[PDB]
Enzyme design. Structure first.
Site, mmCIF file in Angstrom:
data_model
loop_
_atom_site.group_PDB
_atom_site.id
_atom_site.type_symbol
_atom_site.label_atom_id
_atom_site.label_comp_id
_atom_site.label_asym_id
_atom_site.label_seq_id
_atom_site.Cartn_x
_atom_site.Cartn_y
_atom_site.Cartn_z
ATOM 1 N N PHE A 54 0.827 -1.201 0.000
ATOM 2 C CA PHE A 54 0.000 0.000 0.000
ATOM 3 C C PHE A 54 0.866 1.257 0.000
ATOM 4 O O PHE A 54 1.948 1.279 0.588
ATOM 5 C CB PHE A 54 -0.927 0.006 1.217
ATOM 6 C CG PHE A 54 -0.226 0.339 2.503
ATOM 7 C CD1 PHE A 54 -0.110 1.654 2.924
ATOM 8 C CD2 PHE A 54 0.317 -0.663 3.292
ATOM 9 C CE1 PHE A 54 0.535 1.962 4.107
ATOM 10 C CE2 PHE A 54 0.962 -0.361 4.475
ATOM 11 C CZ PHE A 54 1.070 0.954 4.884
ATOM 12 N N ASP A 55 0.383 2.300 -0.665
ATOM 13 C CA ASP A 55 1.111 3.562 -0.741
ATOM 14 C C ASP A 55 2.433 3.381 -1.480
ATOM 15 O O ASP A 55 3.471 3.885 -1.048
ATOM 16 C CB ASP A 55 1.367 4.113 0.661
ATOM 17 C CG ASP A 55 1.401 5.629 0.689
ATOM 18 O OD1 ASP A 55 0.648 6.255 -0.085
ATOM 19 O OD2 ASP A 55 2.183 6.189 1.486
ATOM 20 N N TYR A 100 3.606 4.889 13.707
ATOM 21 C CA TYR A 100 2.449 5.726 14.003
ATOM 22 C C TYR A 100 2.104 5.671 15.488
ATOM 23 O O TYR A 100 0.959 5.894 15.880
ATOM 24 C CB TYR A 100 1.245 5.280 13.171
ATOM 25 C CG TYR A 100 1.381 5.586 11.697
ATOM 26 C CD1 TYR A 100 1.816 6.831 11.263
ATOM 27 C CD2 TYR A 100 1.076 4.628 10.738
ATOM 28 C CE1 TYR A 100 1.941 7.115 9.916
ATOM 29 C CE2 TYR A 100 1.199 4.901 9.390
ATOM 30 C CZ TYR A 100 1.631 6.147 8.984
ATOM 31 O OH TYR A 100 1.756 6.425 7.642
#
Length: 126
Positions: A54-55, A100
């Site tokens: 992803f990304d 995160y």
């Protein structure tokens, strides 16, 4: 340079950041990034638990540019980028701390989960 072996390099003793030599680039300060300057690089995100990507900059075919020495990126990118060389493609593993923190992103990255990201220095300028 016809070797087919990889090497593990821990960015931090804490075990929050660990890069793995995948594709050696140039090697040397001459091929090192410069803080406070528009730098262009390529990297893609991938999960180790799901094994999905992803990304990915390549997934869309668009290079990402940013300025080093800023507080816009996490220690993972700052350290990795500040510990990589030109044409150097490696994979860094970010734990559930430097990434995160405790609050990941949406329901794609649940707290307390290791993530893998591949970074590669393309070229930087002013």
């Amino acid at each position: 340079m016809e070797q087919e072996t990889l090497e593990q390099v821990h960015l931090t003793e804490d075990g929050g950041v660990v890069k793995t030599i995948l594709r050696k680039g140039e090697g040397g300060e001459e091929n090192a990034p410069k803080k406070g300057n528009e730098v262009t690089v390529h990297y893609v995100g991938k999960l180790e638990s799901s094994g999905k990507v992803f990304d990915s900059s390549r997934e869309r075919n668009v290079p990402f540019k940013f300025h080093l020495g800023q507080g816009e990126v996490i220690k993972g990118w700052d350290i990795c980028v500040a510990s990589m060389t030109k044409n150097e493609k490696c994979s860094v593993r970010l734990d559930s701390k430097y990434g995160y923190g405790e609050e990941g992103c949406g329901e794609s990255i649940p707290g307390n989960s290791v993530l893998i990201f591949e970074i590669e220095l393309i070229s930087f300028r002013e």
